[PDB]
Amino acid sequence: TLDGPYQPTSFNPPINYWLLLSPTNAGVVMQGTNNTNRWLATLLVEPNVESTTRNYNLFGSSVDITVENTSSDKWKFIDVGKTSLNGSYVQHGTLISSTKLCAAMKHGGNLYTFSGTTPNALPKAYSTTNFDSVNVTTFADFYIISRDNEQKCRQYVNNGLPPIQNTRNLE
Ligand SMILES: CC(=O)N[C@H]1[C@H](O[C@H]2[C@@H](O)[C@@H](CO)O[C@@H](O[C@H]3[C@H](O)[C@@H](O)[C@H](O)O[C@@H]3CO)[C@@H]2O)O[C@H](CO)[C@@H](O)[C@@H]1O[C@@H]1O[C@H](CO)[C@H](O)[C@H](O)[C@H]1O[C@@H]1O[C@@H](C)[C@@H](O)[C@@H](O)[C@@H]1O
């Protein structure tokens, strides 16, 4: 099977698969909802950004969110979520990254993302509800990696993708 890249799309990912996103621009990298109690997204902020309110298109709504990135040279992914249709978005985990890659996976009812600072970022779980039915819309090219191959996804998130579109053959 070919892990990617695949172009931006919407689907409801099966459990036990990492989605590895390779965004080009700051903004909304991906979003997802179960239409009941979770509306989630990952934001990307470029290096060297003072506290500033930016507009983000989340599920078609214009949402103002105050962000910052005090890293002088690394990009910052920010996990955000709300827990009701009209609730406020809250910022949770962050990933400080020199590779510009982030990832998410549904497993065991939890939603895993990477957090920390590359090259030592690790998957951490969100477990405030059962996330198995949350879908995704990606706004960047992405790769699909099984949990059985989680070590590949950790390696890419922390150290970068290969220089050729052959991740299928490269570990
Ligand atoms: C395998 C492990 O120890 N941690 C991996 C974790 O596995 C946990 C999930 O299956 C989770 C789902 O609910 O269940 C955990 O069991 C917990 C329950 O979470 C908790 O509710 C209950 O009360 O207590 C039990 C305790 O037994 C599982 O342990 O899944 C993560 C997402 O895949 C994964 O990232 C994590 O992998 C480990 O990560 C740590 C760093 O935090 C180290 O790097 C480990 O080396 C790494 O394990 C390695 O990767 C995992 C995916 C698997 O391939 C391992 O065989 C491998 O050594």
Residue numbers in the entry: 64 to 234
Quote the original article:
To understand the structural basis of the interactions between P-VP8* and the type 1 HBGAs, we selected H-T1 pentasaccharide, LNFP I, for co-crystallization with the VP8* protein as the type 1 blood group A and B epitopes share the similar linear sequences LNFP I with an additional GalNAc and Gal residues, respectively. The structure of P-VP8* in complex with LNFP I was determined at a resolution of 1.29 Å. The bound ligand LNFP I showed clear electron density. The edge part of the glycan binding site was composed of β-strand K, I-J loop, and 210-loop (residues 210213, which links the β-strand M and α-helix A), while the base part was formed by W81, M168, and Y175. The binding of H-T1 pentasaccharide involves a network of both direct hydrogen bonding interaction and stabilizing hydrophobic contact. Apart from the reducing terminal Glc(1), all the other four monosaccharide residues Gal(2), GlcNAc(3), Gal(4) and Fuc(5) participate in the interactions. Gal(2) is in direct hydrogen bonding with H170 and N173. The main interactions are with GlcNAc(3), which formed two hydrogen bonds with E213 and one hydrogen bond with R210, in addition to hydrophobic interactions with W81, M168, Y175, and R210. Gal(4) participates in two hydrogen bonding interactions involving the side chain of R217 and also hydrophobic interactions with L185 and P186. However, R217 of P-VP8* has direct hydrogen bonding with the nonreducing Gal residue of LNFP I, and therefore is the key amino acid for selective binding to T1 backbone chain, whereas in the case of P -, P -, and P-VP8*s of the P[II] group RVs, the VP8* interaction with the Gal is through E212.
The P genotypes are further classified into five genogroups, P[I] to P[V], based on the sequences of the spike protein VP8*, one of the two proteolytic fragments of VP4. It has been found that almost all P genotype RVs in P[II], P[III] and P[IV] groups that commonly infect humans recognize histo-blood group antigens (HBGAs) of the host through VP8* in a genotype dependent manner. In the present study, using a multiphasic approach, including X-ray crystallography, glycan microarray with a dedicated probe library, bio-layer interferometry, site-specific mutagenesis, and molecular docking and dynamics simulations, we found that P-VP8* can bind to all blood group A, B and H(O) antigens but on type 1 chain only, without the capability to bind to any Lewis epitopes or mucin O-glycan cores.
